[model samples]
Target: QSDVRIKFEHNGERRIIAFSRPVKYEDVEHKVTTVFGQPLDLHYMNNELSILLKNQDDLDKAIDILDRSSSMKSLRILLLSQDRNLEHHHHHH
Candidate 1:
């Protein structure tokens, strides 16, 4: 499957989540809420998905959780302010 990138902003922080497999939006929300202790508001605009969080801490923790996910090998997060990007590109052999 072709990889896709998802961009969203939370509390003025911009993030990008890229993946190759099928992942439900609800599942992503569940993961964020489970780690951050707050539910996120998900929005889709211009064919891109974005999430809104309550605070910076939640966003930080949620990023950590996403960074540690074993299932999402192709997952990536792009932070605009810091100009830092995390990518987990999966190689199929």
Candidate 2:
């Protein structure tokens, strides 16, 4: 599978997390917890994954942690547009 990009929002600012390659669900959970110090609440929107961090202060910390890791460094961060919508989708296929 191809790499994935996940969007996140905090304090009215948006951030993008791009995975170097597709990842397993359990691995995603483990990585988030290991880096940010807690499990993330992830949602899929329009087939894309998004994570909502419980602690706003963890945003920078998360980015730093991901950007520093050898395996996760490929998970780069970006600035998301204001018009971007993160609503969840209910797919029936």
Candidate 3:
């Protein structure tokens, strides 16, 4: 059997959770909604739930005061995929 583990920090405390059995889509959606206190929009393209902030006023304010500490001319953004193992097997007769 395989398991999925999730770790995060909440309220100045580190927490870890594990699931020995696979979870259904509905269950995951409900859990996320409950945690965020908002409904998640299901993204069909990636089969994932996307949570976007509706209010961008705070973001705009941050951008106004944003400045580079160093004299870098440009900025780059990189997104790295998390490493996880999903075990699967097939039986043939």
Winner by TM-score: 1
Tell me the lDDT of model 3 at 16.
58
lDDT of 3 by residue, 1-93 (tens): 435443433335554555444434455445646775655533221124322222344323322332232333221111122223257754455
Segments of candidate 1 deviating more than 4 angstroms? 46-93
Question: Model 1, poorest ten-residue lDDT window?
Answer: 76-85
TM-score for each prediction?
0.39, 0.35, 0.30
lDDT sort, best first: 1, 2, 3
TM-score of 1: 0.39
Expressed as tens digits, the lDDT of each residue in 1-93 for candidate 1 is 545455656566766666444554555666556645664454322125554343455555545566586554333333223212367654445
Q: lDDT scores for all predictions? A: 0.49, 0.48, 0.37
Cand. 2 Cα-lDDT: 0.48
Question: Which window of ten consecutive residues has the lowest lDDT sum in model 3?
Answer: 73-82
